[PDB]
């Protein structure tokens, strides 16, 4: 296909701070990925972000019923929708499947000691590496947070290691789904 494309993409945002104490609502409109006009709770009126959205901001602001619906979305829409999902959204907790494994070779050769942490929720995780019960502060090549898109995360924190027989390496994962830090071990 070669015909030219035109895209209008509205985005209605609800940003939450201290749970539901301070909520900020944004009504944003994008024409061809360029923002044309917006409504920001904290401003209280529609403002043109670009010259294309200037007639829209003038018109929508001159309509008392449009303004008062925007001005009240923070309780009517934001706070309301937050409370609808809270049980399965804000309070969703899925436990991670931690599994240590090498990238394979002989000891005394260098290797990457992987720590695959899979299928967890939320993305708030802290992964820590240990050599004989002492935290390895450096030599870690993380993959960062990978959003699986099925309300599930995954991260891989590989350790740069020169293994020697008798050494025990332990991966320590701290996450809200667990009361006690999860631990997996690999001995050289």
């Amino acid at each position: 296909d070669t015909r030219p494309r035109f895209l209008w993409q509205p985005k209605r945002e609800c940003h939450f701070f201290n749970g539901t104490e301070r909520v900020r609502f944004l009504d944003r409109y994008f024409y061809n990925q360029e923002e044309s006009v917006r409504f920001d709770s904290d401003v209280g009126e529609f403002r043109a972000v670009t010259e294309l959205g200037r007639p829209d901001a003038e018109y929508w602001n001159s309509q008392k019923d449009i303004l008062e619906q925007a001005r009240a979305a923070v309780d009517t829409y934001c706070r309301h929708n937050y409370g609808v999902g809270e049980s399965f959204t804000v309070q969703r907790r899925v436990q991670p499947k931690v599994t240590v494994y090498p990238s394979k070779t002989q000891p005394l050769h260098h290797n990457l000691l992987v720590c695959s942490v899979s299928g967890f929720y939320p993305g708030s995780i802290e992964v820590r590496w240990f050599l004989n019960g002492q935290e390895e502060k450096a030599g870690m090549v993380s993959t960062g947070l990978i959003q699986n898109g099925d309300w599930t995360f995954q991260t891989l924190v590989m350790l740069e290691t020169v293994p020697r027989s008798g050494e025990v390496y332990t991966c320590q994962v701290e996450h809200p789904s667990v009361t006690s830090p999860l631990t997996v071990e690999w001995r050289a």
Partner: protein, 244 residues
């Protein structure tokens, strides 16, 4: 700045196609059709925005349609008129596309669906001049208008004094009465009073007229009976001021 509808009333025979006309408010983005069967609640039929139906009744696509001819008009078509389709049909319109605003309703169209068009009759209209006792006792004069033997109901009675229509001094029955309550095809009767001062009725230069707009048969409808076609018509009666 109101929603318009035509016609005021419409009489039809079962199985026919009826086209109800409406003129939504000029700048308005949403159009609707609602209907109310006597005794029942006001029911949503169809919603329409940006040359496309928005929401529709469970009953809608099977029995109805909507056409947006020009950019001024909007119409509802009943495909095959049923006895159950005798109702008051309202056309409505909203300004905004967001739907948080009020709906403006038109005056409505009262549709009467009949099994057989044989029992349709226009009204007989008579004016009765004031009682002499009343004038002597109160110095007030009331004329009465009787509209009898009409079928079906929903008729429009009005008073005219010296050519101008009057609403002051007038009172008309909110509902007609059945002439024969034991019959399903019972013809109706209706009354109206017009009260004026004795001084006014006593001036013979004063003209009083009472007329009834009746809605019945169309010129295209089949009429085989001998009596005159009970077509939609205005039946009137009059009286002149009496010095006495």
């Amino acid at each position: 700045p109101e929603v318009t509808q035509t016609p005021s009333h419409q009489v039809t025979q079962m199985g026919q196609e009826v086209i109800l006309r409406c003129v939504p408010i000029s700048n308005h983005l949403y159009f609707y059709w609602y209907r109310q069967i006597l005794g029942q609640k006001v029911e949503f039929l169809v919603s329409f925005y940006n040359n496309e139906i928005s929401e529709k009744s469970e009953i809608f696509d099977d029995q109805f349609s909507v056409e947006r001819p020009d950019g001024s008009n909007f119409t509802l078509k009943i495909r095959s008129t049923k006895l159950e389709d005798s109702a008051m049909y309202f056309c409505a319109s909203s300004r905004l596309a967001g739907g948080m605003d009020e709906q403006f309703f038109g005056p409505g169209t009262r549709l009467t669906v009949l099994e057989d068009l044989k029992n349709v009759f226009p009204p007989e209209v008579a004016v009765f001049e004031p009682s002499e006792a009343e004038i002597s006792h109160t110095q007030k004069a009331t004329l009465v208008c009787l509209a009898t033997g009409f079928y079906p109901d929903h008729v429009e009675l009005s008073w005219w004094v010296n050519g101008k229509e009057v609403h002051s001094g007038v009172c008309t029955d909110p509902q007609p009465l059945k002439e024969q309550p034991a019959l399903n095809d019972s013809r109706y009767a209706l009354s109206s009073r017009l009260r004026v001062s004795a001084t006014f009725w006593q001036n013979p230069r004063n003209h009083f007229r009472c007329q009834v707009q009746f809605y019945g048969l169309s010129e295209n409808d089949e009429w085989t009976q001998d009596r005159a076609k009970p077509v939609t018509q205005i039946v009137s009666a009059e009286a002149w001021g009496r010095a006495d």
